[PDB]
């Protein structure tokens, strides 16, 4: 199995929900980075992982589930198996990353891609090892009622260049975003 990555869209005030939803309208261009980050693999015949817990599975709109492309695994204790549409289901971060290194998926994964929401980012963000933060940052605030967890500069390190990621200010419906990638190894 490849690297391990979290990938996450953030308002100025840290938000990345609301109501069940993202707090901004939609930035179509952004979804195409998303897309683009999470379903890219560099290792022939494999494709990447993604993990996320149980809201953030269902909203997602149904016309895109499972995230095409990609194996879907959805984090929950309450379900007895995965979502309609969904590939796995696992009851923990540690079981899901577990279940990565057994035959079924072994030689199948490349990248892990863990794309929310907040408390399976904070585990995995305080979760030894090396891992890299692909971080939109939405330059406005937005009201939201869920949030992104803290990112400890003392160990995340800002790239100063990322292949494929644009170092310039997007903007799309009247918002201004910027695409950033951050590492830590310990
Ligand atoms: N801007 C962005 O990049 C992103 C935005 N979002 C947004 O955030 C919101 C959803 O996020 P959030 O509310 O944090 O919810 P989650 O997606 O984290 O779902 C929470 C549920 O998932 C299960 N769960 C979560 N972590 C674990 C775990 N480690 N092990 C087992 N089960 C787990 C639980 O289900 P159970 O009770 O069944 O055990 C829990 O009640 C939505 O508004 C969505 O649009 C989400 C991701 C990214
Ligand atoms: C899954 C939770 C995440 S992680 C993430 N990362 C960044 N940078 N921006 C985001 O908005 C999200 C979100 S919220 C989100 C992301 C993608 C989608 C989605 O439907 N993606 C489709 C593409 C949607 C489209 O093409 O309009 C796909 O990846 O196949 C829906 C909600």
Redesign the pocket.
């Known amino acids: 199995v490849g690297s391990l990555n979290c990938?996450?869209?953030?308002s100025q005030n840290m938000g990345?929900?609301?109501?069940?939803?993202?707090p901004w309208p939609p930035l179509r261009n952004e979804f195409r980075y998303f897309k683009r980050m999470t379903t890219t693999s560099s290792v022939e015949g494999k494709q990447n992982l993604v993990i996320?817990?149980?809201?953030?599975?269902f909203?997602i709109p149904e016309k895109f589930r499972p995230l095409k492309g990609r194996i879907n695994l959805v984090?929950?204790?309450?379900?007895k198996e995965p979502p309609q549409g969904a590939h796995f289901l696992?009851?923990?971060?540690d079981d899901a990353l577990k279940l990565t290194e057994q035959p079924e998926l072994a030689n199948k994964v490349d990248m892990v891609w863990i794309?929310?929401?907040?408390?399976?980012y904070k585990?995995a963000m305080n979760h030894p090892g090396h891992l890299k933060l692909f971080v939109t940052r939405i330059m406005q605030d937005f009201e939201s009622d869920?949030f992104f967890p803290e990112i400890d500069l003392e160990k995340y390190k800002l790239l100063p260049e990322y292949p494929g990621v644009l170092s310039d200010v997007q903007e799309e419906k009247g918002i201004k975003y910027k695409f950033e990638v951050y590492e830590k190894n310990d």
Do not use: Q
Request: charged content about 25%; proline content about 0%; overall charge positive.
């Open positions: 990938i996450v869209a953030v990345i929900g609301k109501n069940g939803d993202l996320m817990g149980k809201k953030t599975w909203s984090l929950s204790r309450e379900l696992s009851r923990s971060l794309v929310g929401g907040s408390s399976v585990e869920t």
